Amino acid sequence: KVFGRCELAAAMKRHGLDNYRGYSLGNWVCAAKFESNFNTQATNRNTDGSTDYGILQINSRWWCNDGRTPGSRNLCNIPCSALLSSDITASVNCAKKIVSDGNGMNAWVAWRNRCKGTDVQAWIRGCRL
């Protein structure tokens, strides 16, 4: 599923991401924009052989199982395929664990490079929330 901007913002809010670990909704929408262009089915292979899945491009090295990432963990206790669902519940739940890991949203390098320090509230402007 490719979400609309405000549609995703609404979904993330309903799932309790607004202000989660102090990150306003616009941060999460921004990160999703640059990680996946709001496409739940986005995947990308990393040089180390891991793969990133879903709207927030969650990595198989630590967070999900895909059966093909040697030496990896599955800390969100999910198949990586659940991160591709039209239902964002698994991605949000796993994102909550990631952003709690110590480095906040710096875990998403695209957030650090493209969202951090910018006017992230622009991403939820106009939305009914």
Strands 43-45 and 51-53, by their bridges, are antiparallel
Three-state secondary structure string covering 7-56: HHHHHHHHCCCCCECCECHHHHHHHHHHHHCCECCCEEECCCCCEEECCC
Buried b (16+ CB within 10 A) or exposed e, 106-119: ebbebbeeebbeee
Using CB atoms within 10 A of its CB, is residue 66 exposed (0-12), middle (13-18) or buried (19+)? Answer: middle
Number of independent structural domains in the chain:
1
How many angstroms separate the CA atoms of 5 and 21, rounded?
22
Task: Indicate which technique resolved this structure.
Answer: X-ray
Tokens of 48: 């180390």
Active site residues: 35, 52
Q: Does 87 appear as a known binding residue?
A: no
Give the structural domain span for 54: 1-129
List all residues 6 or more positions away from 75 whose beta carbon is below 8 Å from its beta carbon: 62, 63, 97
Resolution, given in Å to one decimal, reads 1.7
Distances (CA, A) of 27 to 18, 22, 48, 64, 122: 9, 10, 27, 23, 10
Q: Which CATH number characterizes residue 103's domain? A: 1.10.530.10
DSSP lists the bridge partners of residue 10 as none
